[PDB]
Amino acid sequence: QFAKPEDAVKYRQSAFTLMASHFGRMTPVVKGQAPYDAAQIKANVEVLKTLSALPWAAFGPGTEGGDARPEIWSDAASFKQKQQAFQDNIVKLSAAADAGDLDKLRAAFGDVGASCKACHDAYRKK
Amino acid sequence: QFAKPEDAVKYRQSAFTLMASHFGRMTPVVKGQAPYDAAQIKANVEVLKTLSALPWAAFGPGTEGGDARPEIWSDAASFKQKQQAFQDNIVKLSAAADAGDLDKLRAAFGDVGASCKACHDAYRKK
Ligand code: HEC
Ligand code: HEC
Ligand SMILES: O=C1O[C@H]([C@@H](O)CO)C(O)=C1O
Ligand SMILES: O=C1O[C@H]([C@@H](O)CO)C(O)=C1O
């Protein structure tokens, strides 16, 4: 769907921007600094769920650029492993949110964040 | 969810960026220049559906900036009318896509795009 590689870069950066907001905004809730409203969180994780599937199609071949490391393309199976694993951690967070269980939510939140960071560590330029 | 107004600006701009991609990428399909796969389009409009609900919460009070005109806030009921109407046109597009009917999809697509443009004309800076 991208006329030029730059358009794929712009897309994925915007998807990540939204993912950061929908993930990060739950930090005060899982810390207890903000109240836990199970329906609120269930709805927010559903948004996060949708957003978190979007970036991957915007790293198609020829779309090198931004802060994406070239290793995303030379090591495609491993990058795919990392995004699928991340999305499996998002499934786990969805299950916690759907269950309305703050303990499971905090554990699953931490797993998701670790997966974000592990991918950056390997595949996002400094 | 925004630490500073700038973060709300960044959010809404990213949401619009994704909406533009998920809307605009259907242009070749509704023109007949690309094949019509009903399941493909149903799925894409579901994404568009989710994205199109996101910007509005990122124009809260104090979040003036970007290419948002100040009229969004001094005329809140009218801006709310415009976003709700836009989202109702998105409902109409979802119904067309769910029905698998390319004629209804093209008509509904055109209504959505007109609603995007009408809001810009009134509320987005040059
Ligand atoms: C690989 C499997 C990743 C996972 C999982 C997550 N992210 Fe990431 N992110 C990745 C890359 C390769 C890039 C650079 C994209 C580019 O072309 O520049 C990014 C970037 C970001 C950004 C910055 C976006 C911007 O405005 O430029 C943010 C804020 C970000 N990523 C956040 C984020 C979060 C919160 C994640 C888990 C919930 C997450 N990412 C996962 C690669 C990968
Ligand atoms: C008001 C009810 C709007 C509707 C409906 C749509 N948009 Fe819009 N858009 C609006 C504003 C006020 C702004 C400026 C936001 C800012 O703070 O700068 C925008 C901006 C955009 C952009 C540019 C985003 C960027 O990267 O800076 C795009 C690409 C865009 N809008 C697209 C778009 C589409 C495709 C819409 C319908 C499917 C649509 N918008 C509706 C206000 C409103
Ligand atoms: O909110 C965020 O979480 C991840 C990472 O910091 C998790 O440790 C990331 O990159 C964000 O923007
Ligand atoms: O794809 C888009 O459609 C609207 C408008 O052009 C519809 O006429 C818009 O602002 C986009 O980026």
Author numbering:
A (entry chain A), B (entry chain A): 1 to 126
From the paper:
Cytochromes c′ occur in methanotrophic, denitrifying and photosynthetic bacteria and have proposed roles in protection against nitrosative stress, NO trafficking during denitrification or pathogen defence. All cytochromes c′ have a 4 α-helix bundle structure containing a heme centre with a solvent exposed proximal His ligand and a buried hydrophobic distal pocket with a non-coordinated residue (Leu or Phe, rarely Met or Tyr) in a position to exert steric influence on the binding of diatomic gases. Unusually, cytochromes c′ are able to utilize both heme faces (distal and proximal) as a means of discriminating NO from other diatomic gases. In order to understand the factors controlling distal versus proximal NO coordination, we have examined NO binding to AXCP variants in which the occluding distal residue Leu16 is replaced with residues that are smaller (Ala, Val), of comparable size (Ile) or larger (Phe).
